[PDB]
Amino acid sequence: QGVVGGRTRTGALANDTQGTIKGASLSVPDYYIKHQFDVGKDEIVNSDATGK
Amino acid sequence: LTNLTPTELLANKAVDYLANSFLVETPMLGLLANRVINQKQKAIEWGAKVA
């Protein structure tokens, strides 16, 4: 937060620090939450044919 | 004459025949083919009378 200084009515116009905006930066990660499965194509037709 | 129309330019059509003189007879398969059955399930279920 910028700092407020003090001076008399006729006091010298000194300068004081300033509010600092800092650039924050995240990123959509380069790492996935994958879950993947090798469903055998035989267990697809088979399970469709005989599936309770 | 022969020197004209040389071998390289004479692309002569051959009879559309392959001569695949291999396996004239598939006895066991041929007997069971035309009565094979393809089914959507991986196991073969049937009933065998035992007694």
Side-chain angles (χ1 to χ4, degrees), chain B residues 7-46:
Chain B
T7 61
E8 300 96 289
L9 275 297
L10 284 194
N12 49 4
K13 309 172 257 289
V15 63
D16 62 358
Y17 186 75
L18 185 52
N20 194 0
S21 67
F22 282 152
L23 163 54
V24 72
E25 282 289 271
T26 61
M28 183 66 268
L29 173 68
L31 286 159
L32 291 166
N34 310 86
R35 81 183 62 222
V36 299
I37 190 167
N38 313 285
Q39 67 176 14
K40 298 290 181 68
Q41 65 182 357
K42 175 142 91 63
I44 321 304
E45 60 86 20
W46 78 91

Side-chain angles (χ1 to χ4, degrees), chain A residues 2 9-10 20-21 23-25 31-32 34 37 44-46:
Chain A
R9 277 289 197 293
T10 66
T20 81
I21 304 185
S25 71
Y31 194 105
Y32 268 124
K34 67 97 183 174
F37 53 96
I44 287 171
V45 185
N46 184 28

Side-chain angles (χ1 to χ4, degrees), chain A residues 6-41:
Chain A
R7 81 151 148 96
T8 79
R9 277 289 197 293
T10 66
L13 287 175
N15 202 314
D16 42 3
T17 61
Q18 281 302 137
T20 81
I21 304 185
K22 183 63 69 177
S25 71
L26 281 176
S27 56
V28 164
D30 269 349
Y31 194 105
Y32 268 124
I33 312 192
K34 67 97 183 174
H35 160 257
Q36 64 90 26
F37 53 96
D38 60 357
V39 55
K41 210 173 302 169

